[PDB]
């Protein structure tokens, strides 16, 4: 069963990451982004209130909601922190959709995010060191440890 293999890889990836190892480069990117997203959401909450609490979405307007936000986020630039913001926004929009019994939108939002990444963020990412550089900058929970020290 391919499901059993996926469960094994998930668990082993997690335990390797706790020791500073990684199952794969992709696994290292995933973990650093999870950590950066947690930290982003903490900082956002303290300055502006929780990201989920301010979102409006209905199935008939879901793309409009997505693009209105993402277009402003990247209107005047791309950088690693704004890429983290983009992921955190998508997560919050999915949580809000589930809260409001609009579960159908989770799959749509995931697709819109992947397409936006492919078309509009990947060019910048490839010119700025790729996801390997993101891991160098954000791995080992680096953004949170920075705030914790100050």
């Amino acid at each position: 069963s391919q499901s059993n293999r996926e469960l094994v890889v998930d668990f082993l990836s997690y335990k390797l990451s706790q020791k500073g190892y990684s199952w794969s480069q992709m696994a290292a990117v995933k973990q650093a982004l999870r950590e950066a997203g947690d930290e982003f959401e903490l900082r956002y909450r303290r300055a502006f209130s929780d990201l989920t609490s301010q979102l409006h979405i209905t199935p008939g307007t879901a793309y409009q909601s997505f693009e209105q936000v993402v277009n402003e986020l990247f209107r005047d630039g791309v950088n690693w922190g704004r890429i983290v913001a983009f992921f955190s926004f998508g997560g919050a929009l999915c949580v809000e959709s589930v809260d409001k019994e609009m579960q159908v939108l989770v799959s749509r939002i995931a697709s819109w995010m992947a397409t936006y990444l492919n078309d509009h963020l990947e060019p910048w990412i490839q010119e700025n060191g790729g996801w390997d550089t993101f891991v160098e900058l954000y791995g080992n929970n680096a953004a949170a440890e920075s705030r914790k020290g100050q």
Binding site: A36, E39, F40, R43, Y44, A47, F48, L51, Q54, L55, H56, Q64, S65, Q68, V69, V70, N71, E72, L73, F74, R75, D76, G77, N79, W80, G81, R82, I83, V84, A85, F86, S88, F89, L137, Y138, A142, A143, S146
Partner: peptide
């Protein structure tokens, strides 16, 4: 728009958590 203002706030915090070498 309201969602536009969320995008602006995301950019502000994104710039705060942005890291450089």
């Amino acid at each position: 728009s309201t969602m536009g203002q969320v995008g602006r706030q995301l950019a502000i915090i994104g710039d705060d958590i942005n890291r450089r070498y």
